[PDB]
Design a protein around this ligand. Sequence first.
Ligand SMILES: C[C@H](CCC(=O)O)[C@H]1CC[C@H]2[C@@H]3[C@H](O)C[C@@H]4C[C@H](O)CC[C@]4(C)[C@H]3C[C@H](O)[C@]12C
Ligand SMILES: C[C@H](CCC(=O)O)[C@H]1CC[C@H]2[C@@H]3[C@H](O)C[C@@H]4C[C@H](O)CC[C@]4(C)[C@H]3C[C@H](O)[C@]12C
Ligand SMILES: C[C@H](CCC(=O)O)[C@H]1CC[C@H]2[C@@H]3[C@H](O)C[C@@H]4C[C@H](O)CC[C@]4(C)[C@H]3C[C@H](O)[C@]12C
Ligand SMILES: C[C@H](CCC(=O)O)[C@H]1CC[C@H]2[C@@H]3[C@H](O)C[C@@H]4C[C@H](O)CC[C@]4(C)[C@H]3C[C@H](O)[C@]12C
Ligand SMILES: C[C@H](CCC(=O)O)[C@H]1CC[C@H]2[C@@H]3[C@H](O)C[C@@H]4C[C@H](O)CC[C@]4(C)[C@H]3C[C@H](O)[C@]12C
Ligand SMILES: C[C@H](CCC(=O)O)[C@H]1CC[C@H]2[C@@H]3[C@H](O)C[C@@H]4C[C@H](O)CC[C@]4(C)[C@H]3C[C@H](O)[C@]12C
Ligand code: FES
Ligand code: FES
Lengths: 359, 359
Amino acid sequence: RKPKTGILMLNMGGPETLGDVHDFLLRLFLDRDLMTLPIQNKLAPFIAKRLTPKIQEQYRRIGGGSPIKIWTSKQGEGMVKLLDELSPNTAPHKYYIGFRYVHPLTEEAIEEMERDGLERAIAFTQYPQYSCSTTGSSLNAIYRYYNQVGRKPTMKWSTIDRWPTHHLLIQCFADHILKELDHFPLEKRSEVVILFSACSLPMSVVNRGDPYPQEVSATVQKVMERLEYCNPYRLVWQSKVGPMPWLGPQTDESIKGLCERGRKNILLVPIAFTSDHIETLYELDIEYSQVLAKECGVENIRRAESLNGNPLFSKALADLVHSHIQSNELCSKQLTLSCPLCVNPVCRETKSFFTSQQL
Amino acid sequence: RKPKTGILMLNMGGPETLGDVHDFLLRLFLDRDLMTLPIQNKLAPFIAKRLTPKIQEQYRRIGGGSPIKIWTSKQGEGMVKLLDELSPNTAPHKYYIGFRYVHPLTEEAIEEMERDGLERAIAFTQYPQYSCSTTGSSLNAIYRYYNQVGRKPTMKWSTIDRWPTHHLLIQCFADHILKELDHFPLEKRSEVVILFSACSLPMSVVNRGDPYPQEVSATVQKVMERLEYCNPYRLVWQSKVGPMPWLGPQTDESIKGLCERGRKNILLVPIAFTSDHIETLYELDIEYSQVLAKECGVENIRRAESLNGNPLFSKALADLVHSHIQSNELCSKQLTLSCPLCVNPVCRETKSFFTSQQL
Ligand SMILES: C[C@H](CCC(=O)O)[C@H]1CC[C@H]2[C@@H]3[C@H](O)C[C@@H]4C[C@H](O)CC[C@]4(C)[C@H]3C[C@H](O)[C@]12C
Ligand SMILES: C[C@H](CCC(=O)O)[C@H]1CC[C@H]2[C@@H]3[C@H](O)C[C@@H]4C[C@H](O)CC[C@]4(C)[C@H]3C[C@H](O)[C@]12C
Ligand SMILES: C[C@H](CCC(=O)O)[C@H]1CC[C@H]2[C@@H]3[C@H](O)C[C@@H]4C[C@H](O)CC[C@]4(C)[C@H]3C[C@H](O)[C@]12C
Ligand SMILES: C[C@H](CCC(=O)O)[C@H]1CC[C@H]2[C@@H]3[C@H](O)C[C@@H]4C[C@H](O)CC[C@]4(C)[C@H]3C[C@H](O)[C@]12C
Ligand SMILES: C[C@H](CCC(=O)O)[C@H]1CC[C@H]2[C@@H]3[C@H](O)C[C@@H]4C[C@H](O)CC[C@]4(C)[C@H]3C[C@H](O)[C@]12C
Ligand SMILES: C[C@H](CCC(=O)O)[C@H]1CC[C@H]2[C@@H]3[C@H](O)C[C@@H]4C[C@H](O)CC[C@]4(C)[C@H]3C[C@H](O)[C@]12C
Ligand code: FES
Ligand code: FES
């Protein structure tokens, strides 16, 4: 009955209600692994307070809050149900949600995992493609937690730090793309252009050696091969913010560019997310698909459904955990290599934390 | 005996002797598909004249010229020898070299193909990953040739515009990587970090929608999967020139960054080339491996051998051409979609040239 193997599902997280926005932002601007700012401890709360109204407004526009926790919970529960049958030797399994910037925080989840007296602890990132700003930050949080609490872990840790091409992940994306293509008018099906849209990164980050771009590209290639290249495509990036240079082409500019060039039937695909969030429900669905799309004269613009509750996805999660357990992997080979230009000293410490785990 | 099917092998080309450097640079700065410049016809010759001495010196450092024509010739001959047995229906086959900036020029090749009175003409790019600046420019020259000569083609055209993940291309890279890893001291094999190095692109090109980065990334992923992720890796970009922003991380800075961080056993892999040229023999072998490496205190830095004369590569070429002929493909689906922000009007005309081909 008592849990033996815990699977900590890592994700940035998102505010559940408009009221959670302020703290979400605050924790986010306080994260050194994400950004360094002068008098950060004083500025952060300030920047959070001023951005709060604008961000709360974005969440109001999609219903009043993020569904991330609901979808994560459902995927986790489905995963556990399967794991108990897949790996009896490591059962019972229990999933824990460790959101980086909102409750339940990564730290709270770890505290709970230790209290449950687990034997196994698997840091399972929910970002298929690795970025030092996403998965890396979550992994650093785990290392820092123990380093700050001043005491070693009581469970054997390991991580599934990336999985950009897991065959079931690719199948889920391909299936969702195909069913969405079936939603376009029959006459336009073959004319549709697929825009794979992933979260962009500042060029300063890309230039230090971030693995993200290459991995996202890998996922896209895998999805397209499974679709047998039925339609032309392009990998574009969204969510750029600020005056600094980010990796492009931007998704909004691409949509606008495509229309002005006669390609008015577009299928957007959130290729770097496993569930819905503000980036898909607001940026892609409203900002680009409703507003921008109208101003540009698009004929048809649709978005592949996010993986969310697809039973195949829960199966994907379970297979990954199962394979990870059977291989005795502590982490991917890729995690043993820090960015060539990494300037964050905790990265090497975090890497060692997982590569040095007992058993 | 009379040639029936012609295979136009497209490549940038390189100066065979130091004396060819000047016209090489001249033709390169005159290409609108490559770069627009004020009073280009006047600036181009000037720019070529001032760069000539420095470029000639680079070629002198590697032996006095580029081996590209020699390697292209051997691969083409190997390809033809195989095609004559693989596809008796389209034999005899003849290969033609169409370098973009040096003799034999793409135009001279087309002129020769027409004189040979071929029935089938295949534009076979030698760049596995498509870039509007490489393959795109070569395809544009074919269209521009007929449009400038004021005559319709006498042969049925088609193109193999990209092949970033052909299984035999991937096996060739994997094989060369493994044999090069064997050259490292046994004690450091597992410590080696693989730097996949591809030619960089200015961010202005990346941002308009160039498919190159995503395709190179795809190749890297396939190679690593075949090597079963034996070693950690990172995809880096080389050859940045000028003050403008280019896609990074840069190969030279990554090598230096890796050394500073204790990773002194590096294996360089020219993932976007099929043979040796100035970028590998000079930039990677001399500039980075001999000079930069010494100043950084590298323990061991080697470079995977270029595909060059590997018989498996000629097999790859013949299989690509064979499958292309069997499928009646006119071009890839990807070619039917121009960059979302393309501003070159010839791109659409070039695309149409191939997609509209009779038969
Ligand atoms: C200078 C620094 C960025 C440094 C960097 O290049 O990394 C930026 C990051 C966030 C900026 C702040 C935020 O944009 C919030 C405020 C915006 C106002 O227009 C100026 C003050 C303001 C308080 C900004 C001051 C300054 O320009 C900050 C602190
Ligand atoms: C730029 C940075 C990622 C940096 C990196 O590549 O390491 C990302 C991570 C989380 C992002 C923030 C979060 O998504 C929360 C906010 C979302 C808003 O749409 C923009 C501001 C907002 C505050 C974002 C700013 C910026 O895009 C952040 C800070
Ligand atoms: C846009 C937002 C300020 C909003 C506001 O004050 O209204 C600012 C505050 C801090 C900024 C971030 C920080 O300066 C850290 C990063 C600096 C890089 O040059 C761009 C990305 C980067 C992640 C910035 C993105 C964006 O410009 C942020 C998030
Ligand atoms: C202005 C133009 C770029 C225009 C654009 O990209 O929008 C750039 C491209 C190449 C430049 C030229 C090349 O760098 C060669 C010369 C360099 C000298 O320092 C100035 C004159 C010189 C002849 C430059 C003039 C001008 O700045 C050019 C022509
Ligand atoms: C920048 C441009 C590619 C632009 C694009 O992708 O659109 C590339 C194509 C060919 C390149 C040139 C050729 O490789 C020939 C020269 C090589 C030298 O090492 C630098 C100068 C040199 C003259 C290069 C300058 C620049 O990097 C060029 C002009
Ligand atoms: C470096 C070289 C000038 C060398 C010299 O005169 O000493 C200049 C001449 C024309 C330049 C190119 C042209 O301006 C066209 C492109 C302009 C972009 O802003 C950078 C890439 C871009 C492809 C430039 C690369 C590089 O800076 C070039 C190739
Ligand atoms: S920033 Fe990537 S490993 Fe440190
Ligand atoms: S620049 Fe890419 S299609 Fe024209």
